[PDB]
Design a protein around this ligand. Structure first.
Ligand SMILES: N#C/C=C/c1cccc(-c2nc3cnc4[nH]ccc4c3n2C2CCCCC2)c1
Ligand SMILES: NC(=O)Nc1ccccc1
Length: 292
């Protein structure tokens, strides 16, 4: 039978890789021989899951299984067993971890060339998603994995959703918890998501890259600075005002002028004024290839 069914009894828990409110990703060994020689895999499972979370998890599985890109984390299979909440998503395990941590650890040896390479790879992964009409909704350096020092892959499809065939956006109900500083203003204000709201998020990823995810100039830190001595204004309320005024994150010192221009375009107020990933990719490819 298919290599995509992993027997539950053979999955041996090792450690946690990620957690959210409704699920976790765990490092596990798939060990059918029982001698601790099996492959390592990353396994997602739900906790505190109601029907809605279970239904979304089914969606996540079917999306990831259908993606075949060098820049998207690889689906391996599922597992299940008796009773409920036992459905698991098995993926490849990337021991180098996430790009956010990699940039903070290795900042001093990673030049603008390499950051341009990462940006171009992430953009290609998002172009691939765009062609399949998938809105990722969690594009952030913490969800990008390092396959090797010159190869990254997009992960965390827990919020990903397909566009309908007849509409280029979708709307959610006022959900659980969003990373407000990565989200498009229409997403924040009206729960509208699209490929173009992902582009806005990509701009914030470029900002992360070219600050090396430094905590002192994180988006949240920059927001707090953009706050005058008013500390008790709800962040979301104030962010939305700042964005409406045309305020945006500053150009990082490591950031070439061309990349800053691309960030600014990713953050166009109107989603239809934002470039597609297919337009951004050649620009970043030119900049990467040119700095080699
Ligand atoms: N900021 C920050 C920190 C992020 C962080 C820290 C430790 C581990 C990981 C991690 N390693 C992974 C290795 N193979 C994997 N396969 C699929 C997801 C996956 C891995 N994840 C995460 C990636 C996002 C979703 C949750 C697990 C991310
Ligand atoms: N896209 C963008 O510029 N967002 C932003 C602006 C100010 C503070 C934090 C985030």
């Amino acid at each position: 039978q298919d290599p995509t069914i992993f027997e539950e009894r053979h999955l041996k828990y090792i450690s946690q890789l990620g957690k959210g409110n409704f699920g976790s990703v765990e490092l596990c060994r798939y060990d059918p021989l029982g001698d601790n020689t099996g492959a390592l895999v990353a396994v997602k499972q739900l906790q505190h899951s109601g029907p809605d979370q279970q239904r979304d998890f089914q969606r996540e599985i079917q999306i990831l299984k259908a993606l075949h890109s060098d820049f998207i984390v690889k689906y391996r299979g599922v597992s299940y067993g008796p009773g409920r909440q036992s459905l698991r998503l098995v993926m490849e395990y990337l021991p180098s971890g996430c790009l956010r941590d990699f940039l903070q650890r290795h900042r001093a040896r990673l030049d603008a060339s390499r950051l341009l390479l990462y940006s171009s790879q992430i953009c290609k992964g998002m172009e691939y998603l765009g062609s399949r009409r998938c809105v990722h909704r969690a594009l952030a350096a913490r969800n990008i994995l390092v396959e090797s020092e010159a190869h990254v892959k997009i992960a965390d499809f827990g919020l990903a959703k397909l566009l309908p065939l007849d509409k280029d956006y979708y709307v959610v109900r006022e959900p659980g918890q969003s990373p407000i500083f990565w989200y498009a203003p229409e997403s924040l204000s009206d729960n509208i998501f699209s490929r173009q709201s992902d582009v806005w998020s990509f701009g914030v990823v470029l900002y992360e890259l070219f600050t090396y995810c430094d905590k002192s100039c994180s988006p949240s830190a920059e927001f707090l600075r953009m706050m005058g001595s008013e500390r008790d204004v709800p962040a979301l309320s104030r962010l939305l005002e700042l964005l409406e005024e045309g305020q945006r994150l500053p150009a990082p010192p490591a950031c070439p002028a061309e990349v800053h221009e691309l960030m600014k375009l990713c953050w166009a107020p109107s989603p239809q004024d934002r470039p597609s990933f297919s337009a951004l990719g050649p620009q970043l490819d030119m900049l990467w290839s040119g700095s080699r």
